[PDB]
CHARMM-style PDB file with segment names, atoms N, HN, CA, C and O in Angstrom:
ATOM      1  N   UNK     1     125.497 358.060 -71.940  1.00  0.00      PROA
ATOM      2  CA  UNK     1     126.680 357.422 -72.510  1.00  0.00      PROA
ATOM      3  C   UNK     1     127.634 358.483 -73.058  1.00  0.00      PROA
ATOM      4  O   UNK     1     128.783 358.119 -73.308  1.00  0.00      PROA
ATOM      5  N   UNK     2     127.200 360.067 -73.324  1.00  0.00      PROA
ATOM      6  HN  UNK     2     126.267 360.362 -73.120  1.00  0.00      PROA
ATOM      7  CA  UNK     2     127.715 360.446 -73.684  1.00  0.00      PROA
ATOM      8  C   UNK     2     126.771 361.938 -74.641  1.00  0.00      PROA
ATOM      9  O   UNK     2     127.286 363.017 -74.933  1.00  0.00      PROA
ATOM     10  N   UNK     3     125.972 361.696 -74.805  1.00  0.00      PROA
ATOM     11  HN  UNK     3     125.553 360.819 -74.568  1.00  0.00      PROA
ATOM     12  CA  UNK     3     125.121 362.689 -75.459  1.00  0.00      PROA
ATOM     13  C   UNK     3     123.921 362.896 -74.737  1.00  0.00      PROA
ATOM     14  O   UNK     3     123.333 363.960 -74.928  1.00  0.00      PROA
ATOM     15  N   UNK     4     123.373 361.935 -73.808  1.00  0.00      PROA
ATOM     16  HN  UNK     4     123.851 361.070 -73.653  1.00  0.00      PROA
ATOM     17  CA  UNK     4     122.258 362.370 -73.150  1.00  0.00      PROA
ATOM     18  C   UNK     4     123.011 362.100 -71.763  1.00  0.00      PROA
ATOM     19  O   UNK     4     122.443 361.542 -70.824  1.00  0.00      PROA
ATOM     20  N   UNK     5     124.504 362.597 -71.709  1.00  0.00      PROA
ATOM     21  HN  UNK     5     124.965 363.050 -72.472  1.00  0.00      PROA
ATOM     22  CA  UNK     5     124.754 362.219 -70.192  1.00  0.00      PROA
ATOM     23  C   UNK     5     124.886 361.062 -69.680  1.00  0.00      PROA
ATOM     24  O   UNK     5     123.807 360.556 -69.371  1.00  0.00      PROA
ATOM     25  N   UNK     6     126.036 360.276 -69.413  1.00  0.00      PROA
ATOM     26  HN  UNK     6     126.913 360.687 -69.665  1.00  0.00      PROA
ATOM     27  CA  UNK     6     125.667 358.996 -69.167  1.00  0.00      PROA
ATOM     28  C   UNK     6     126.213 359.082 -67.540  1.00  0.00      PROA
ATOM     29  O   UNK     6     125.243 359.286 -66.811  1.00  0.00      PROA
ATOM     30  N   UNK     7     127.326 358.996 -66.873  1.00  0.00      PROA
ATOM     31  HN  UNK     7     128.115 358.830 -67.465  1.00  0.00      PROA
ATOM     32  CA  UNK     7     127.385 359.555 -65.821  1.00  0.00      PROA
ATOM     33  C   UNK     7     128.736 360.675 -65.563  1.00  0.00      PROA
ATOM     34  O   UNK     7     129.002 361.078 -64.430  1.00  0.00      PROA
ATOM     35  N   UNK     8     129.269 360.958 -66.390  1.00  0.00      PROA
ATOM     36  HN  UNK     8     129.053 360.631 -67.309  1.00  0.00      PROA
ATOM     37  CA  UNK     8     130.033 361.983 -66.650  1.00  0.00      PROA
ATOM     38  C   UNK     8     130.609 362.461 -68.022  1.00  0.00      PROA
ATOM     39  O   UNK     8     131.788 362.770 -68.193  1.00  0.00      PROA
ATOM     40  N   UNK     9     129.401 362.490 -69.206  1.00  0.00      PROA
ATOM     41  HN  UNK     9     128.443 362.239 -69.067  1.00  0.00      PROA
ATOM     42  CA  UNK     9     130.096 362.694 -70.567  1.00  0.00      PROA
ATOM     43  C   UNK     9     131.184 361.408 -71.085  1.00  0.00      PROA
ATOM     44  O   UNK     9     132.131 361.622 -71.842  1.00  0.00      PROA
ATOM     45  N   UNK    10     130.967 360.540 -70.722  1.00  0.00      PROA
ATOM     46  HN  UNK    10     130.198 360.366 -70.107  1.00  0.00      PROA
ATOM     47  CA  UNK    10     131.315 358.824 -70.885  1.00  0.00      PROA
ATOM     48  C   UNK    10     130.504 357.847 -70.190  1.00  0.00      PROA
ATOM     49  O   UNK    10     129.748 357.991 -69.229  1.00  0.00      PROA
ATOM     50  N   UNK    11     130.850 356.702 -70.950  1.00  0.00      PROA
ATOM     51  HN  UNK    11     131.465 356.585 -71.730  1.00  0.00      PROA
ATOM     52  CA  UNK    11     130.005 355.632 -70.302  1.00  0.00      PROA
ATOM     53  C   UNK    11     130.524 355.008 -68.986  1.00  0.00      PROA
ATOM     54  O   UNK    11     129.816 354.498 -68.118  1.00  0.00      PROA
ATOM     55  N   UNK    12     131.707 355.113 -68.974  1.00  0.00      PROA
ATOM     56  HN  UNK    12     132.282 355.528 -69.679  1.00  0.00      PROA
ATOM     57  CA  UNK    12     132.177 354.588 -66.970  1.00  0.00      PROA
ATOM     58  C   UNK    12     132.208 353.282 -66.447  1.00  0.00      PROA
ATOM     59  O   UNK    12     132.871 352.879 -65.492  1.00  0.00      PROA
ATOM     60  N   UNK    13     131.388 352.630 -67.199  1.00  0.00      PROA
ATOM     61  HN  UNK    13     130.848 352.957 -67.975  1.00  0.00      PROA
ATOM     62  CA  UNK    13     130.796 351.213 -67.152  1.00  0.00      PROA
ATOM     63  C   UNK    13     131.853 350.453 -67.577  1.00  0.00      PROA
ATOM     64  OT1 UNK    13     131.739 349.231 -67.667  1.00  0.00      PROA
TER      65      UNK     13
END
């Protein structure tokens, strides 16, 4: 999502 990577340092979703 953002700290463990979500799919680009944001959630995208």
């Amino acid at each position: 999502l953002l700290p463990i990577v979500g799919n680009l340092l944001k959630s995208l979703l």
